[PDB]
Design a protein around this nucleic acid. Structure first.
Lengths: 145, 22, 129, 158
RNA sequence: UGGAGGUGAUUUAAAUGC
RNA sequence: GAGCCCGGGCUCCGUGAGGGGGGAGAAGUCGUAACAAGGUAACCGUAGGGGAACCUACGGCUCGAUCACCUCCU
RNA sequence: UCUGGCACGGCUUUUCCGGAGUGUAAAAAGCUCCGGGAAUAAGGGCUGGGCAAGGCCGGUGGCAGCCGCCGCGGUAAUACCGGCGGCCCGAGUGGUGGCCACUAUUAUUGGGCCUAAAGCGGCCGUAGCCGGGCCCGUAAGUCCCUGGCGAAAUCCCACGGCUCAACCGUGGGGCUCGCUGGGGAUACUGCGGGCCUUGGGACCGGGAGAGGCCGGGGGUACCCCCGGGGUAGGGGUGAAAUCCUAUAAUCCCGGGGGGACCGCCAGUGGCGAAGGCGCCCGGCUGGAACGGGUCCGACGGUGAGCGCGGAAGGCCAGGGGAGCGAACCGGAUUAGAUACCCGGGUAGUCCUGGCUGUAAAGGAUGCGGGCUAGGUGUCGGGCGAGCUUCGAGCUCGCCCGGUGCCGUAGGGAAGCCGUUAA
RNA sequence: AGGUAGUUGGUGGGGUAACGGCCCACCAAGCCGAAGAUCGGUACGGGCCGUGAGAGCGGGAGCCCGGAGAUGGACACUGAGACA
């Protein structure tokens, strides 16, 4: 007998087996409880605006060294401290301290910061409801306050 | 190795369990 | 103990086959196996058999032509509607040609192909191809 | 063939005569056979050993084949010959021999208690009884009100 | 020709390198 | 017959000195533990002891050591 | 610049303007008819390997950056930035997040578990699932037929409608599909009854063994203590020291006392569920093999829960203590040594009662049944012979049970396994 | 992992449009649970929907179908119908 009971009336055993053994998929367990949804702030969401507390630059990882542009932003309803990775070359410039900065994830919600960056779970798109890739190109719009 | 760890785990446990017992 | 005596017949019969002995001996014996070998012979898969009923047991000595590839019982022995046949057709058998998914039926016992021509079904018993 | 129970060891291959009707070079009447049986149950021998002595002395391998047909409801054989007379123990011999032995163990253990192995077969013989009980209840040689225990084993033997 | 035990065993030979 | 209130018990949310560990950074220090019999074979469960790696006792195991010495086996 | 491009020549003319009705049952929607009428909205991503589907120049220089991963930038970068070329797709294209697929990475279909993750240390049996043959009843599951019914929509197919399709209309099908009523079949399964010995259990007689317990009894060696004999050491090491011995050690002879244990025997051997088990003798006792199936007549398997046994260490209470010996006390070693080596030494090691319950508790391999070349050695039981010391004592072969090794077919990733299966 | 005291049932009665522990008087000690009750979390439910060769897995959005609600919480009249 390769595992399983096989027999007309047994099925229930089957039926509980699977479920018992389903909870060894971390991902499945996690969603079905909602640990994905509780822990890594957002309250689950696509994105979150927040006030730029300051600008900080951190070091790169193991084979690497280079100053990544990171913000510290506070999500507003979430009310949680988030350090964050900023796309683009010049950028850290166009972000004034205490402009609104909308924030997203970057590269699988699992926790995985991209290979270079240690911490950074997240991405920035925006400065005063106009984005960073729009501010890398000179023409498209340029910033205020 | 597992010598190490068992006694480290035990010492951690005791010392901490001492700190709980106290 | 044993259970599925049929199956322990069949399984010999095939592992018997795969070696390429000449004839078989199956120590436990029965209707199920008897009947199934009967239907099996009827399609032709096997040559002739004699059973001797010893005061102990029936035994079947079976003659092996060479035809059989694989012939096996079904595990929980599922009930199968005559609409669901086609599913169980595609799965177990090797192609449309063969058609001894041996089921047990209201009419008696049949292959798959002898079942379909009548039009009647039920719980599965074994297979042969 | 085998069952290695409380063992790893393949069982004896002792096997029956494949005779289905009886020898006629051997000769006994339904009446003569019946006498032989009754005489032996009168001695204090028991049905297996009764079938044993009849085999070794009177040359009848099993009673069923010789006797039936003489009332072809079923095969006529030792204890079914006994019950019609009232010589049958209401406990089946199977269950009896078992329990019989068991009570002897206990006395050993009584005096000697430092015995692993001897302790461990007490556990191995009870649990065959239990089974043998369980099914009989349902077949009906032993009432459903019964249940097995070591004081209710010391009462059946005495 | 290839495998399993039972017991002598040898201190005369020294830490580390992105 | 609601909300409302009052005294106590229990639980949960926002938040706090202090405290634990992880995956790391690999330019300071101590040692050589394992990986080669790693230079005292190694691991193992248990117990004590040592700053550390770890050592030792007792029992086990070979995923065990290198010839030598003795014993068996196609 | 021949993939294509440009000049030039000709054609037609999406938007856009104006008109007719419409529609409104007021507009707008400005559609739709007609007149006027222009070649007139195209972009985003990527181009190192993966994915290749697509490569040069210039800047820059492990920087700044790129980045989904694997990596790429440390002075000739196809991977970065810009340009130039090229690939994709196209009013889209790309980023983050979620779900499903890929992922037989949740195994029903359709996974494993010796060594990769993963067998419970072993057994018992409750609940459960799963069940030898043969006959008869029922027809509960099961199949067949009819009948009540599971709204419309969505889906799929046809035809028809709107310029086309989307969308809609008509007709046919399917639909969670979990319900019901009646008739019919009786292989299978359930249930009921009867019947049988292949499984199981059970018995009798021969038989081996380190199985358990209990009582009995002998000897070895170590130590200790006493007398005698006998002097200048011995102990210990790579060297040494601490330490033994001068009221005499070691050594030898004789006498006595104590506790532990039982080399060779001894086997590639036996027994045990497992932990494990070894002087001899007797009593009690567990298991096991075989010949004869002589008796019971499916009583079976497995087994969550549950219950029980379980080395060494540890712990508890009592008794004991030679040797040995964690901790510990000295010496050496060593750069230092909390060690390896040596000299002392407590707990413990032994006995009795109890607790504790762990392991590389291994064959890293759960149990039961059936099937699938063989060979050889070995243990025990049976059988036909020869030998004989007349005892299965020495051998040959078939068979049964066990215990090893080698190997065909097959399996495995390979090592290996291979009728004691992986 | 054990829960249950109008709690499970019985007799008689009330109230209600009406049966009913719905409510109540008396009597009984049941009732439910390892075929997982109770408690805790989470969540409208269905038609469908997404995806997937299928088996399956995830999902309750317009729309339809049924239930619940109307600042939180309680309360009656008036009416066939509301606790609106």
């Amino acid at each position: 007998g390769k595992k399983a009971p096989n027999g007309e009336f047994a099925g229930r055993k089957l039926k509980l087996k699977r479920k018992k053994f389903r909870w060894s998929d971390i991902r499945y367990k996690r969603r079905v409880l909602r640990l994905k949804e509780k822990s890594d702030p957002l309250e689950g969401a696509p994105q979150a605006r927040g006030i730029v507390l300051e600008k900080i630059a951190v070091e790169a990882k193991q084979p690497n060294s280079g100053m990544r542009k990171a913000v510290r932003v506070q999500l507003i309803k979430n009310g949680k401290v988030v350090t964050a990775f900023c796309p683009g070359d010049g950028a850290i410039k166009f972000i004034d301290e205490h402009d609104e900065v909308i924030i997203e994830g970057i590269g699988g919600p699992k926790g995985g910061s991209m290979g270079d960056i240690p911490g950074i779970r997240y991405k920035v798109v925006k400065v005063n409801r106009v984005s960073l890739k729009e501010l890398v190109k000179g023409r498209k719009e340029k910033p205020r306050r | 190795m597992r010598w190490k760890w068992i006694k480290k785990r035990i010492r951690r446990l005791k010392r901490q369990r001492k700190k709980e017992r106290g | 103990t044993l259970l599925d005596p049929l199956a322990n017949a069949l399984s010999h019969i095939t592992n018997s086959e795969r070696v390429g002995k000449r004839e078989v001996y199956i120590k436990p014996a029965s209707k199920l196996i008897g009947e199934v070998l009967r239907v099996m012979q009827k399609y032709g898969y096997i040559g002739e058999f004699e059973f001797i009923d010893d005061g102990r047991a029936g035994v079947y000595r079976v003659q092996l032509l060479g035809r059989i590839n694989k012939a096996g019982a079904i595990k929980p022995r599922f009930p199968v509607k005559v609409s669901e046949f086609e599913k169980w057709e595609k799965r177990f058998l090797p192609a449309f040609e063969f058609g001894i998914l041996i089921v047990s039926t209201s009419q008696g016992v049949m292959s798959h192909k002898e079942a379909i021509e009548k039009g009647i079904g039920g719980r599965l018993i074994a297979y042969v191809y | 063939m085998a069952r290695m129970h409380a063992r790893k060891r393949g069982k004896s291959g002792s096997k029956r005569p494949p005779r289905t009707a009886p020898p006629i070079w051997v000769e006994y009447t339904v009446e003569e056979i019946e006498n032989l049986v009754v005489k032996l149950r009168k001695e204090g021998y028991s049905t297996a050993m009764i079938g044993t002595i009849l085999r070794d002395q009177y040359g009848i391998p099993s009673v069923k084949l010789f006797k039936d047909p003489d009332n072809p409801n079923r095969n006529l054989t030792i204890t079914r010959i006994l019950e019609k007379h009232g010589l049958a123990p209401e406990i089946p011999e199977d269950l009896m021999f078992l329990i019989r032995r068991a009570v002897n163990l206990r006395k050993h253990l009584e005096q000697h208690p430092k015995d692993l192995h001897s302790m461990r077969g007490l556990q191995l013989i009870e649990s065959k009884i239990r089974r043998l009980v369980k099914y009989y209840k349902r077949k009906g040689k032993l009432p459903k009100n019964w249940r097995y225990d070591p004081e209710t084993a010391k009462l059946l033997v005495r």
